[PDB]
Write a protein that binds this ligand. Sequence first.
Ligand SMILES: Cc1oc(CNc2ncnc3[nH]c4ccccc4c23)cc1C(=O)O
Length: 167
Amino acid sequence: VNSFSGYLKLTDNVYIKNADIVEEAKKVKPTVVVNAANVYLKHGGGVAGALNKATNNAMQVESDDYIATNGPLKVGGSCVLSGHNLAKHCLHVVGPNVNKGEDIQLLKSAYENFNQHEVLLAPLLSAGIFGADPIHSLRVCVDTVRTNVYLAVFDKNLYDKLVSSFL
Ligand SMILES: Cc1oc(CNc2ncnc3[nH]c4ccccc4c23)cc1C(=O)O
């Protein structure tokens, strides 16, 4: 039993809710919240900008030190950093950004990072400002992630479409 509430069960291991991931993290304080990161960990907008704003920019400060030491992530890759006031840990995962021309096949590799964590609160990778089709992202999630994932979808309209079209 875990503390996630109000989710619709899609499969054995994937759950979904219309929610603001920032508010959801603040309430649940999950072990892992996933950030929709870019390779530079520049958390300017979308999910990343909202998560970082909720940490009062501490996420960005920590991220800048990470990049200065380690260099950029790979598209499809990830790193574990602090969850600050939102979670124990933040798993920064880089999905392909269609608005940069990145290969959508890398979306499966991005979701594979979730399998290193037993339970996660996460957004749909490559959705929103990353330009992928969220219905496709949900399908890849279900077909790739084997650990327990609680998906927060900010937009109510999109949430209803994702549920209604789910196979
Ligand atoms: C996970 C997510 O993606 C988005 C923005 N992209 C889209 N939004 C609604 N319909 C959409 N059709 C599409 C067809 C092709 C590409 C993108 C969209 C798309 C907002 C959210 C959210 O979490 O609220």
